[PDB]
Write a protein that binds this ligand. Structure first.
Ligand SMILES: N[C@@H]1CCN(C[C@H](O)COc2ccc(Cl)c(Cl)c2)C1
Lengths: 1034, 200, 100, 50, 50, 50, 50
């Protein structure tokens, strides 16, 4: 095939042009996102039942929905939470590769049939099914700098004016309002209601009667009379529009004639549908829109479009309204992509420089400069074909594959130049001879690298999804590089290279280049002499190889494991948890203290703080809060102490002195869609209807047992809330009947006053808005206020709650958990340092085996995937080893010569480990893929050396030792120059300390170490392996 | 204004009409609830009476020759035609007295759109028309957008249905020609191993 | 039994608010009638899988379903693949004139 | 000349065919009744059938 | 999957019209074979459960 | 695969059964499928040997 | 079993084996539907079936 394109250079140029055009089209059309879909598809069902505790929601909503989640395909598991705020969230997690749309529609349809079984209030509020397996692309906050607008006002303005156009922006998949529209709030005064013998039931009935849409009919409607000429639609009672209309609602008329209006016994205003959450941006009231990226969309273009649309909106805003960006990771994505592209470009430039340093020929240096970009563009086209996007994993995979690409180009060009300078043949015939020498080796290398890299794509779960990006990217780049080395590169060598003399090795040159040529010739002579000396005493170096292998095993065993490095993305979080029973005001004071610390003690590092009082992590209540701290640009934060690591630890140390509140600052996970890399996730299941108390007892026993093993388990804690005091109202039903008070009226009054009641809708400025009736805050604060509320009896007398009900204080769960339809409790932990996660999970299982009867357990989250993919790697890599051996045997026509190649694998690996051991890095995904690339490059070099030696032995009468020496002599230069090019290209990644430096260091350090040790060792270990193998099996 | 401008060009546009309905009059009924309660007639009764008599009310199902069918109660036509027929309909009170609608209701005339259209989430109006004999639809669309460019601020236009496809085809024709020419050139260069024959 | 403006405010705008972010959607056209009917057509790109588009439109609609008036849920909100042209008209007459 | 001819050639999408069927839409003023529409429709039917 | 989706999309139009007792029992839409894949029985060897 | 998943679920449930409760399989066609496929594989091996 | 159960006077009792594929049924069997397509009723349909 190489001979075909040497005679047809224009045809090869046409192929290269087609590849370039395809790659360009892909680049213009590829999606761009920080990460691909890594988390398994997940569907969340959210429902709200206002005014109810956790147990009420669980018994009336959660269990009913869970019992109907049947017949849904590819469901891995299901979990649910029922909070004391009246909210239930049910997350159904499905197998990887499941169509998210199909799973979502199946869940929604099973919930459609279960809707009639839910309370009428849940049906009225609505149950929403959403895809929760993604995260926000951006958060656009809106503040007022004048203080003239409350949080509700800003939220209503954003809903009415901003949300629709932002949703219509291209690339925007979902927009979530951080707030709510206006709602007609009726704050009832119990004293005024008792004055006119009224109850919340009367208010609700009056609102329903006097705020409604009534179908009226039509004038001259069909069937008409024989002479009808006019046809008009009849309009009748329509929904109210303003607070004035609602205040004019008539509740009763007294005998004296005085009218009782809704304004008399209640305050009418436009408030928020909910008040649980209070959002502040640097201490000012704020609302916001969370924007998710659409599937197949470009993150950078979508962010630019969103910002442009916001700029277009800005001139029409009310005075004082300002746009901010509390949570924006798009700058981090942009800088990361820029860093990777710069790495590629400087790698190409460094390859050019090394080509010119070694060959001292300009037209030779162009050939790789044309080959490598063509292969990269073809790789982009292949990624587009297979439905991949431009993300961190694929971009770093391309960065890793640069080594193999430049190696192929360098091999072809350098071999052609060597043939030209040795046999003195003109470029065309020299290229023919070189390709005849290396074509079979290149094909075998392609097969071997496919065997090495393909098995990564067959891992299961989220980790499998991560390694499939690298697998596809590197395999496609390698295949395109090999095809280019057989199609375009030989044609370029034949058409562009100038002839070289039969014996010109560069010693005749002057200046730096002549000295370099003489130095390299003498170094090659010394290296060949040393290699011969080694081959005379191969046994000692075989012992040395055994030592190297043992050290490799040592370092591999003692290297810690991880998934992805943490990154300084310009934002981090601070969670505040107050004691059970704490109120919104206390949490707000704690959050204000946190914000003051962040904006005063870290004013050079922190741009803004977005404090959200009302929900945190694994809970939502008045005693929890979360603050999203955005950092200044990395340029404005120079040094180790100004990064997220140091800043977060300083913040945690400062907050440790806060009393009556646990405050913790921490960095984001590498992929926010999964909070993985925090050990193990455990579920303790009530399998025999034991109850909440017995489940709590079992969980306490398990935690106590786990605390007795500090050497294996660290920070084993519950992921939930402890039982909190609750105020029990025992309504004496016989007394209620005796005094002529209906239980329905009692319950309606209690719930509406203290819990709030949604009544119906009203049309405000052309938008439907909810109408809520609740007690004025003054009269629903303390137990004594219960005595301020009266209920009318059939006789017409207002009876107080004390006449037919008692009260007391009990204990109850503010957050009830379920797993797979059964009551459960979630336990988080991690293995002790120096311990693997698998053995920690084994110890947890052993401890759980000794728990009370009827208590089971399960593994969820990352533990479930770990159990799914625990044993996959050894089997797939054994298959990879077998396939590599078979391919090498096919290439060499021998069953034993392959071994001389396969023994090179440790030589690189050890170095990587050392580089990972000294720098303090861990065995993460980037380290593993870099290790694979180093192994591939080492195998390529060994394959070329062995091919040259065996060709000398077979096609010529040269002996084993002589052939080995001549082969290493011929292969030294390309090996050294490729290693130099790749090491220089990855130097920036190793030295990187700015944005994205975690991933860059993880990718670069292992590659550097492995390449250094592979180049140093293989050049005189591969000949040893070849000679030993040929001596044993001959 | 756009339709009037289009009518000035009979030689290019023909049968230019709006695909919509003009604003229609509507009869608004104001039911005074406090008067109804004073007279002892429930508001729900009044609403049911008005809706059933004038708008027709679907009660429940019956069986006709084995098929489930609807049961409707509605006023007879002659008591349902003119606005002054409202007075003939009475509603019983809590004491059994029959109260007229005039005793607690008034009425007026307003105007409203019987069909409101939106395109891409914004209010819109659909216009239909043809190209005059001897003219092509491309020329008709060109003239239509020329006329639309002279409309007040905040009033844009767009093409939908057949016209959207025609616009897309016209827009993407030149790129199709260029790509096809490049592909043929590259194929010739590949086959005949020369840049000369492809150019010639 | 609702005006075109009222049904547009209560139904059409609420529904079409969440009809954004669907794959391969070329455009959307809606209308609201004086009889309370709301008719919203979403035209997608040629070659789009109509089944997947219908499923996605359902997934986006179920977010707005609770926000519609109770009478709308009672009448039923239908999402289905649609065409704008009649394939054929099959009329039925009575040649005896005995049937109205 | 080729460029000149190309620029001046009017554009369309697809030629219109005689498919043996066409439509006639009728719209009366706002508030018109079914009987007036029936009268107009009866006129159209008469035109085509006479 | 799509067949079940369409069937339920048509069934949710009739669901409001069904008797309330029918709705409270739970209407089910399923895509299964007409024959049992298996039968998993449960007994009590001690005989202490009816 | 569905039968295997059901058996795994029943195995998960079994440790928490009340004393005396026990699972049976009064109707399972899976053993027939297993034995039939195994018999055909055996015939293939014996054909190779012959 | 069928011969023994034919002596049971209290019921129609039949033992039977399933086919290779349940849905295919017997290779010589046919399934027929008699439709009331004029609103005749249940009794007239019964008479026609008889
Ligand atoms: N609907 C309630 C009302 C207010 N609203 C606040 C949001 O919590 C905004 O807070 C953030 C900020 C950044 C990220 Cl990434 C996330 Cl997930 C959440 C919540």
């Amino acid at each position: 095939m190489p001979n075909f394109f040497i005679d047809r250079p224009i045809f090869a140029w046409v192929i290269a042009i087609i590849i370039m055009l395809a790659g360009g089209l892909a680049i213009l059309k590829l999606p761009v996102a920080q990460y691909p879909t890594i988390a398994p598809p997940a569907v969340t069902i959210s429902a709200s039942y206002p005014g109810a505790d956790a147990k009420t929601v669980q018994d009336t909503v959660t269990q009913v929905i869970e019992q109907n989640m049947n017949g849904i395909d590819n469901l891995m598991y299901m979990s649910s939470n029922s909070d004391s705020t009246g909210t239930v969230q049910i997350t159904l997690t499905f197998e990887s590769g499941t169509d998210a749309d199909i799973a979502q529609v199946q869940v929604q349809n099973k919930l459609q049939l279960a809707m009639p079984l839910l309370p009428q209030e849940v049906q009225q509020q609505g149950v929403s099914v959403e895809k929760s397996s993604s995260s926000f692309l951006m958060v656009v906050g809106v503040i007022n700098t004048d203080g003239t607008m409350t949080q509700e006002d800003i939220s209503d303005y954003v809903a009415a004016n901003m949300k629709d156009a932002i949703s219509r922006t291209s690339g925007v998949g979902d927009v979530q309002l951080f707030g709510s529209q206006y709602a007609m709030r009726i704050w009832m005064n119990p004293n005024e209601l008792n004055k006119f013998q009224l109850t919340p039931v009367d208010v609700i009935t009056a609102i329903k009667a006097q705020n409604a849409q009534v179908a009226a009919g039509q004038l001259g409607g069909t069937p008409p009379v024989k002479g009808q000429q006019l046809n008009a639609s009849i309009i009748a009672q329509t929904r109210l529009t303003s607070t004035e209309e609602f205040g004019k609602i008539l509740l009763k008329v007294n005998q004296d004639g005085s009218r009782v209006l809704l304004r008399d016994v209640a305050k009418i205003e436009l408030g928020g549908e909910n008040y649980d959450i209070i959002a502040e941006f640097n201490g000012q009231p704020a609302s916001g829109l969370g924007i998710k990226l659409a599937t197949g969309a470009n993150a950078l273009d979508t962010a630019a479009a969103i910002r442009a649309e916001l700029a277009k909106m800005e001139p029409f805003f009310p005075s004082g309204l300002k746009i901010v960006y509390p949570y924006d990771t798009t700058p981090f994505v942009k800088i990361s992509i820029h860093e990777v592209v710069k790495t590629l470009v400087e790698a190409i430039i460094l390859v050019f420089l090394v080509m010119y340093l070694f060959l001292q020929n300009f037209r030779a240096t162009l050939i790789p400069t044309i080959a490598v970009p063509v292969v990269l563009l073809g790789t982009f086209a292949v990624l587009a074909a297979f439905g991949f996007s431009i993300n961190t994993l694929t971009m770093f995979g391309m960065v890793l594959a640069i080594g193999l690409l430049v190696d192929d180009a360098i091999v072809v060009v350098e071999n052609v130049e060597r043939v030209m300078a040795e046999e003195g043949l003109p470029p065309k015939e020299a290229t023919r001879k070189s390709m005849g020498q290396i074509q079979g080796a290149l094909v075998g290398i392609a097969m071997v690298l496919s065997a090495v890299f393909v098995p990564m794509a067959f891992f299961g779960g989220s980790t499998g999804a991560i390694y499939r990006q690298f697998s596809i990217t590197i395999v496609s780049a390698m295949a395109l590089s090999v095809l280019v080395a057989l199609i375009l590169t030989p044609a370029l060598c034949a058409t562009m290279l100038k002839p070289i003399a039969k014996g010109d090795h560069g010693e005749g040159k002057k200046g730096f280049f002549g000295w370099f040529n003489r130095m390299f010739e003498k170094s090659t002579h010394h290296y060949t002499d040393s290699v011969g000396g080694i081959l005379r005493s191969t046994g000692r170096y075989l012992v040395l190889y055994l030592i190297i292998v043992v050290g490799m095993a040592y370092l591999f065993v003692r290297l810690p494991s991880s998934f992805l490095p943490d990154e300084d993305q310009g934002v981090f979080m601070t969670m505040v948890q107050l004691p059970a029973g704490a109120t919104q005001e206390r949490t707000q004071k704690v959050l204000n203290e946190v914000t003051h610390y962040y904006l005063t003690k870290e004013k050079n590092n922190v741009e803004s703080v977005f404090a959200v009082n009302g929900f945190g992590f694994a809970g939502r209540g008045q005693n929890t809060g979360i603050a999203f701290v955005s950092l200044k640009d990395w340029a404005d934060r120079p040094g180790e102490e100004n990064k997220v690591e140091a800043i977060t630890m300083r913040a945690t140390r400062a907050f440790s002195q806060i009393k009556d509140a646990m405050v913790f600052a921490f960095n984001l996970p590498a992929i926010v869609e999964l909070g993985t890399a925090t050990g193990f996730d455990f579920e303790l299941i009530d399998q025999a209807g034991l109850g909440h108390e017995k489940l709590t007892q079992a969980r306490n026993q398990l935690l106590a047992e786990a605390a007795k093993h500090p050497d294996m388990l660290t920070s084993v804690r519950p992921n939930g809330l402890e039982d909190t005091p609750q105020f029990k109202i025992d309504i004496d039903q016989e007394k209620a009947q005796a005094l002529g008070v209906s239980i329905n009226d009692i319950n309606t009054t209690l719930g509406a006053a203290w819990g709030g009641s949604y009544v119906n809708d009203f049309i405000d400025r052309g938008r439907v808005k909810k109408v809520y009736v609740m007690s004025e805050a003054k009269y629903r604060m303390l137990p004594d206020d219960i005595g301020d509320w009266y209920v009318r009896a059939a006789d017409g007398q207002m009876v107080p709650f004390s006449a037919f009900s008692s009260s007391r204080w009990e204990y109850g769960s503010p957050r009830l958990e379920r797993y797979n339809g059964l009551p459960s409790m979630e336990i988080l932990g991690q293995a002790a340092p120096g311990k693997s996660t698998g053995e920690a999970m084994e110890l947890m299982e052993q401890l759980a085996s000794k728990l009370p009867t009827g208590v089971g357990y399960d593994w969820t989250g990352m533990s479930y995937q770990e159990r799914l993919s625990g044993n996959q790697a050894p089997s797939l890599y054994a298959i990879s080893l077998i396939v590599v051996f078979l391919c090498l045997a096919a290439l060499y026509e021998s069953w034993s010569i392959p071994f001389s190649v396969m023994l090179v694998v440790p030589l690189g690996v050890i170095g990587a480990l050392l580089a990972a051991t000294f720098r303090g890095l861990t065995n993460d995904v980037y380290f593993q893929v870099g290790l694979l690339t180093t192994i591939g490059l080492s195998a390529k070099n060994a394959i070329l050396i062995v091919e040259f030696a065996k060709d000398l032995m077979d096609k010529e009468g040269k002996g084993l030792i002589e052939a080995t020496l001549d082969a290493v002599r011929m292969r030294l230069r390309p090996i050294l120059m490729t290693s130099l090019a790749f090491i220089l290209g990855v130097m920036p990644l190793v030295i990187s300390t700015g944005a994205g430096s975690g991933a860059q260091n993880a990718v670069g350090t292992g590659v550097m170490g492995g390449m250094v040790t592979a180049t140093v060792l293989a050049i005189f270990f591969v000949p040893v392996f070849f000679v030993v193998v040929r001596r044993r099996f001959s």
